[PDB]
């Protein structure tokens, strides 16, 4: 249910996740009905409600929420711009 990842940004003012995550720090925000997402001074929650991504080979990619309008998005890890392979999305 939900997860978190220590801060890794060594700056006290960032917040970055997975290799699609990466803004300057602010607050903390969380959608009506699509993702959730907080920036803790010591470690970043997120949570996902959306549908998940399946037929997705788990082979090297990441899945990320685009909380702009409310869908599942997955990047590479040596590719923080091309979409990994994707099948469809199961609730």
């Given at each position: 249910?939900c997860?978190?990842?220590?801060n890794?940004?060594?700056?006290?003012?960032?917040c970055?996740?997975?290799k699609?995550?990466?803004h300057?720090?602010?607050?903390?925000?969380?959608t009506?009905d699509?993702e959730?997402?907080?920036?803790?001074?010591?470690?970043?929650s997120?949570?996902?409600?959306?549908a998940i991504?399946?037929?997705?080979d788990?082979?090297k990619?990441?899945?990320?929420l685009?909380?702009?309008?409310?869908?599942?998005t997955?990047?590479?890890?040596?590719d923080?711009?091309?979409?990994?392979?994707?099948?469809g999305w199961?609730?």
């Amino acid at each position: 249910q939900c997860y978190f990842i220590p801060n890794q940004s060594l700056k006290p003012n960032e917040c970055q996740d997975l290799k699609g995550v990466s803004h300057p720090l602010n607050s903390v925000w969380k959608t009506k009905d699509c993702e959730e997402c907080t920036c803790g001074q010591d470690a970043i929650s997120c949570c996902n409600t959306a549908a998940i991504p399946t037929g997705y080979d788990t082979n090297k990619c990441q899945k990320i929420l685009n909380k702009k309008t409310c869908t599942y998005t997955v990047v590479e890890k040596k590719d923080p711009g091309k979409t990994c392979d994707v099948t469809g999305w199961v609730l």
